[PDB]
Amino acid sequence: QQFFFENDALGQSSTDFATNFLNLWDNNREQLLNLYSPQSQFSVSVDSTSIGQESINSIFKTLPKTKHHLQEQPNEYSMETISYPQINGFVITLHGFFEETSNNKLSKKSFDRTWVIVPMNNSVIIASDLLTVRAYSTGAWKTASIAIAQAAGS
């Protein structure tokens, strides 16, 4: 329920969500499976520059350990949230970078992850999780404002 999702006009829920998700994604991905259902779907890809808690868990354990800096370096990420009327849910997309660890070294990497969420049980179920990892680069969205660049449509 720490993933309780309200659709506040302030975009705070979208931020809590992304924060709590990544945190666990960085320290305890296993705990994220609760948010996935038998019919949930996950996919990753890499830019020229999996279904059900199990399969999804599988590759989750595969994917390299990481470290995001959403709360410390907010400005380094942008976010849009749109309603998904058809499933009485929402789509949250987060653009930014994280620190990637196979040559045992730490490299920066940009990405765009899109979570399709359907609020429920004072929480949410992730219907779709589309991750696109790409060559690190500075977000073409930054401003003097030290904070996530938000946008919401509905």
Binding site: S43, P85, I87, D112, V116, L130, S137, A140, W141
Partner: protein, 128 residues
């Protein structure tokens, strides 16, 4: 199978954003009468207003697919695409664009009239 159908339509869409001919009307026909569109952080309730802004304000563009994922969500009766492109404007350097789209199944059954209900278009990166 279904794979292709999508990636192609994805392109069709990109094709339109690239076509300068203010003759556009059938493009707007890809969006139904109830939307959700964001462009570079800017919302638009009507694909009309948006496309108007585009043809009227945006410059000549050149889009190139470089990643296209998607999930068809069960019961929803639609699917969602996680697209990636680069773009040029006059032709200059390449910019990075991230694009999510919510589209209707119907397309898989060749139906193209107003199937775009989700349009999240955002530039993620630019020249070095």
């Amino acid at each position: 199978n279904q794979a292709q159908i999508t990636a192609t339509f994805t392109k069709k869409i990109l094709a339109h954003l690239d076509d300068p001919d203010s003759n556009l009307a059938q493009f707007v026909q890809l969006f139904n009468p109830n939307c959700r569109i964001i462009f570079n952080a800017t919302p638009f309730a009507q694909a009309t207003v948006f496309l108007q802004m585009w043809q009227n304000q945006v410059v000549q563009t050149q889009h190139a697919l470089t990643g296209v994922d998607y999930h068809a969500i069960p019961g929803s009766g639609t699917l969602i695409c996680n697209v990636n492109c680069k773009v040029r404007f006059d032709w200059g350097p390449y910019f990075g664009i991230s694009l999510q789209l919510i589209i209707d199944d119907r397309i898989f059954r060749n139906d193209f009239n107003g199937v775009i209900s989700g349009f999240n278009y955002n530039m993620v990166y630019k020249p070095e």
